[PDB]
Design a protein around this nucleic acid. Structure first.
Ligand SMILES: [K+]
Ligand SMILES: [Mg+2]
Ligand SMILES: [Mg+2]
Ligand SMILES: [Mg+2]
Lengths: 170, 148, 142, 220
RNA sequence: AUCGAAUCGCCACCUACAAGACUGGAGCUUGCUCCCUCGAAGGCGCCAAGUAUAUUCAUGAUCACAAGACA
C-alpha cells in the first residue's frame, strides 16, 4: 500500500520541536498517541517519549524486539546499514541543504546567486540551438508557417521590381 | 583612555578597518564598499569602495547607516595616514565633476593601493565581483533571519 | 499600394533575428520592508491614538519583531500644492506634492509579529489606515 | 465602461496598460465560514481579492439541514412593506459575499471600501483564466478541517434547490473551460520537455566550481 | 493640456485536472520486499548577455519620499 507502518524498529524523523529534522528508532509503543524513541548515533537522541503527531515514518525498519537493550539496538543498526542507505536519498540531501542555507553569510549568498545565473545563461544557449533546428518556441513556430506562404508570392515579378527599387532607394 | 582624548572610541567590533560594508542610506544606497578608518574623537567612518568598481569615492559615513559583514580584506599595506578631517573640511562661502587636485591625487593613491591589496588577497576575483554586486530587498525576503 | 507588403517584410526580419532573452531588473534598489497600518491601540472602550500598530511582511513571530525595535518608519502621501521640503534650494528636483511623516518602532505587539510605532510629535492620520508603511533598516545594530 | 475624457487623458499622457495587484482564490472544497473570516481580515488589511468557483464551497452537516436553515432565513420579511425588507440572494457567489459582509463594519466608509474591494464569480470566467496562478487557503480546506466520516454539503445543490436558476449553465461553461485548458496543456508538453532537457544539459557546459556550489546548496 | 503627485516582481516553463482511508512501477506474504528519475523545490530576476584579474562614476560634500522608475 506504499505507506510505512508504525512498528518496533521503524525509523522515523522528528517534525517539530527542539529535536526537529533528526532521526530515531522506535523501541516500544505506549498507546495510540505515544511511542518511545532512541538513537545511539546522535548525542541528543537518548531514550524518550514522542507524540505520534510529531513523527514521519521512513522506509527502513531494523529487526529488534520491544523494549530492547541499548547494546542490542546498536548492533542491529550497524548490521542493517539503514543510516548509510538513508543518507544517500534526495530528501536527506534536501534537509542538509536547508541547514546550510540558514547559516550562510552574505558572501556565500552572492556565490550562490552567481552559480544560478551561470546555469540559466547556459540553458538559454543550449535551448537556442535545438530551437533553430527543430522549431518549438512561439516565434520560431510562426516563422515556419509564415515563410512557406510568404515566399511563394514574394517571387512575383512586380514584388521583385518593387523590392529592387526600394532596396536601391535606400 | 580618557573620554577627552582623541583616541577614545566606542565603535562596535564588527566595523573593523578592512571589512566590507553595505550602505543603507544616501546617494550610494545599496552599494558595497570597504571600511578604511574612523576619524578621531569618535567620529564617522571613511569608505572608498573603491571607485573603479562601484563608483563610490572616498566618503564619510556614520556607523549606524552601514551593515558590516564578516568578509574582510587585509588592508595593512595601504597606509591610510593622509586621510584626516582637514581634507573633509570645506571653506565657508558668504554673501552669494569639480574635484580638487589634492583630493584627486589622494583618491588615485588610495585606490591603487586598495586594488593591489584586493588582487593580492586570495579569492580576489570573487571579492571583486562581490564589490561590484548590488544589494536590494526582494519580495519574500526576511533579512531579520539572515546571518551576515 | 497596400501596406501589407512592407509590414510583413518587417515582421519576417523581426521574428527571425530575435533570440531567447529575459527581463532583468537593473533599476534603483529598494532598501526598506513593506508594511501596512492596521490601526491604533484600543480596547472595547475605545482607541488610543498616539500609538499605532503596523504589520510587516514576512514577520510572523514575536522574536522576528524584536529585531526591528528602534528602526525608523515613514508614511508617504501627497497633498494638493507644492510646499517646502528638505533641500528645497540645494536640490530643486525634489520639489513635489509628495510628503512624508516619520516615526520609530518601540516594542512588539502580541505573538504574531505586529509592532507598535510612535510618530514624531503628532500622531499619524486616520486616513492612513490600510495603506503602505515603510520600515527602513537603519539605525543598524550589525 | 471608461469615459471619453478618461480615454483622452490616457492618450495624452501616453501610458501603457495598467493592472493593480489582485489575488485570485480558488474556493473549491473550502469551509465557508473560515474562508470568509480569512478573506475579511485580508480585505480590512487592504488587499484586492477575486474569488472563483463559489458554487463548490462546503458546509458541514446534511443538505436537508442546511436547506432548512436557509428557508428559516428566507422567512424573515418586513410585514408592512416587503420591498424595504431583507433581500435574500440565491446565487452561491452572493451567499459568499453576504457572509463576508456580515464580518465587516458595513456601516462605515472603511467597511464599504473593504467590501467594494471584493469580486466574486461562479466558475472561472475568461477574463480571469489567463491572469496567473490561483491560490488556496491551507487552514480552511475540507480535507484538513472535516473528519471524513461525517457528511457535508455542496453549496451549489442547496442554492439550486432553494431558488438558483443557473446551475446547468455554470456546469456547461465549466466543462467547456476544462476541455479547452486540457487541450492547451496537452500542447506545449514538447516545449516543457525541451526546457527541462536544456537545464539538464547546461551542467556539463557551466564551470566546475559553480557546479560544486550548486551541489553544496542542493540545487544540483 | 492643467498634472506636481501615493503604489515599487515578471514570464509565450505557474497561469490544466483530480485525491488526502493511497501519490513513481511491480510482487505476493498484505505489510513487507525489489526496481526507478529515489517520491518535502513553478522558471527567471538582484549590475560584464556571464564568472573572467574588462570598464565613466566624486563637490548631490554624514539620515531626510526614490534627485530614479516602459525589467
Ligand atoms: K423582503
Ligand atoms: Mg563631511
Ligand atoms: Mg457584525
Ligand atoms: Mg520622489
Amino acid at each position: 500500500v506504499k505507506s510505512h507502518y508504525i512498528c518496533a524498529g521503524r525509523l522515523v524523523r522528528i517534525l517539530r520541536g527542539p529535536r526537529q529534522d533528526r532521526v530515531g528508532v522506535i523501541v516500544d509503543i505506549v498507546d495510540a498517541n505515544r511511542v518511545l524513541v532512541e538513537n545511539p548515533e546522535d548525542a541528543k537522541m537518548w531514550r524518550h517519549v514522542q507524540n505520534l503527531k510529531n513523527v514521519e515514518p521512513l522506509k527502513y525498519c531494523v529487526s529488534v524486539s520491544r523494549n530492547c537493550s541499548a547494546k542490542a539496538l546498536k548492533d542491529a543498526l550497524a548490521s542493517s546499514k539503514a543510516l548509510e542507505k538513508y543518507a544517500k536519498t534526495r530528501t536527506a540531501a534536501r534537509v542538509e541543504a536547508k541547514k546550510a542555507c540558514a547559516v550562510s553569510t552574505d558572501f556565500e549568498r552572492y556565490q550562490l546567486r552567481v552559480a544560478r545565473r551561470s546555469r540559466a545563461h547556459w540553458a538559454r544557449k543550449v535551448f537556442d540551438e535545438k530551437d533553430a533546428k527543430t522549431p518549438v518556441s512561439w516565434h520560431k513556430v510562426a516563422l515556419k508557417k509564415m515563410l512557406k506562404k510568404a515566399a511563394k508570392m514574394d517571387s512575383t515579378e512586380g514584388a521583385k521590381r518593387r523590392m529592387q527599387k526600394a532596396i536601391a532607394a535606400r | 583612555v580618557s573620554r577627552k582624548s582623541p583616541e577614545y572610541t566606542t565603535l562596535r567590533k564588527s566595523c573593523a578597518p578592512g571589512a566590507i560594508a553595505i550602505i543603507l542610506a544616501g546617494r550610494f544606497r545599496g552599494r558595497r564598499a570597504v571600511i578604511l578608518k574612523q576619524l578621531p574623537h569618535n567620529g564617522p567612518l571613511v569608505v572608498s569602495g573603491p571607485m573603479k568598481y562601484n563608483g563610490v569615492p572616498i566618503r564619510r559615513i556614520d556607523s549606524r547607516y552601514v551593515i558590516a559583514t564578516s568578509t574582510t580584506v587585509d588592508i595593512s599595506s595601504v597606509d591610510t595616514a593622509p586621510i584626516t578631517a582637514e581634507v573633509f573640511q570645506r571653506p565657508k562661502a558668504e554673501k552669494p565633476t569639480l574635484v580638487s587636485d589634492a583630493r584627486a591625487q589622494l583618491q588615485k593613491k588610495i585606490d591603487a593601493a586598495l586594488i593591489a591589496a584586493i588582487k593580492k588577497d586570495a579569492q580576489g576575483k570573487e571579492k571583486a565581483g562581490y564589490l561590484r554586486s548590488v544589494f536590494t530587498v526582494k519580495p519574500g525576503d526576511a533579512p531579520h533571519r539572515w546571518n551576515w | 499600394t497596400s501596406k501589407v507588403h512592407s509590414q510583413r517584410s518587417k515582421k519576417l526580419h523581426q521574428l527571425s533575428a530575435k533570440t531567447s532573452r529575459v527581463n532583468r531588473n537593473r533599476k534603483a534598489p529598494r532598501l526598506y520592508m513593506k508594511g501596512t497600518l492596521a490601526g491604533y491601540t484600543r480596547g472595547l472602550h475605545g482607541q488610543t491614538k498616539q500609538t499605532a500598530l503596523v504589520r510587516v511582511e514576512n514577520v510572523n513571530t514575536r522574536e522576528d519583531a524584536t529585531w526591528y525595535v528602534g528602526k525608523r518608519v515613514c508614511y508617504v502621501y501627497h497633498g494638493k500644492k507644492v510646499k517646502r521640503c528638505v533641500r528645497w534650494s540645494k536640490a530643486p528636483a525634489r520639489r513635489s506634492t509628495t510628503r512624508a511623516l516619520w516615526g520609530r518602532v518601540t516594542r512588539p505587539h502580541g505573538n504574531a509579529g505586529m509592532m507598535r510605532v510612535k510618530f514624531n510629535g503628532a500622531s499619524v492620520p486616520a486616513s492612513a489606515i490600510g495603506r503602505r508603511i515603510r520600515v527602513y533598516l537603519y539605525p543598524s545594530q550589525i | 465602461f471608461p469615459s471619453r475624457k478618461d480615454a483622452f487623458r490616457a492618450q495624452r499622457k501616453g501610458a501603457k496598460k495598467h493592472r493593480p495587484e489582485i489575488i485570485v482564490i480558488d474556493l473549491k472544497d473550502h469551509v465557508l465560514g473560515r474562508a470568509a473570516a480569512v478573506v475579511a481580515k485580508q480585505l480590512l488589511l487592504g488587499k484586492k481579492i477575486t474569488v472563483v468557483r463559489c458554487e463548490q464551497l462546503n458546509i458541514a452537516g446534511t443538505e436537508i439541514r442546511n436547506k432548512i436553515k436557509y428557508l428559516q432565513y428566507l422567512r424573515k420579511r418586513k410585514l408592512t412593506n416587503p420591498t424595504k425588507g431583507p433581500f435574500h440572494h440565491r446565487a452561491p457567489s452572493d451567499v459568499f459575499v453576504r457572509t463576508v459582509r456580515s464580518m465587516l463594519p458595513r456601516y462605515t466608509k472603511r467597511g464599504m471600501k473593504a467590501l467594494n474591494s471584493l469580486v466574486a464569480y461562479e466558475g472561472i470566467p475568461p477574463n480571469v483564466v489567463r491572469t496567473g496562478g490561483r491560490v488556496v487557503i491551507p487552514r480552511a480546506q475540507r480535507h484538513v478541517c472535516y473528519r471524513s466520516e461525517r457528511p457535508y454539503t455542496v453549496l451549489g445543490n442547496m442554492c439550486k434547490h432553494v431558488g438558483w436558476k443557473y446551475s446547468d449553465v455554470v456546469a456547461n461553461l465549466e466543462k467547456a473551460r476544462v476541455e479547452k485548458a486540457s487541450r492547451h496543456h496537452e500542447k506545449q508538453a514538447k516545449l516543457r520537455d525541451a526546457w527541462k532537457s536544456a537545464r539538464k544539459e547546461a551542467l556539463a557546459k557551466m564551470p566546475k566550481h559553480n557546479v560544486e556550489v550548486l551541489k553544496k546548496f542542493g540545487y544540483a
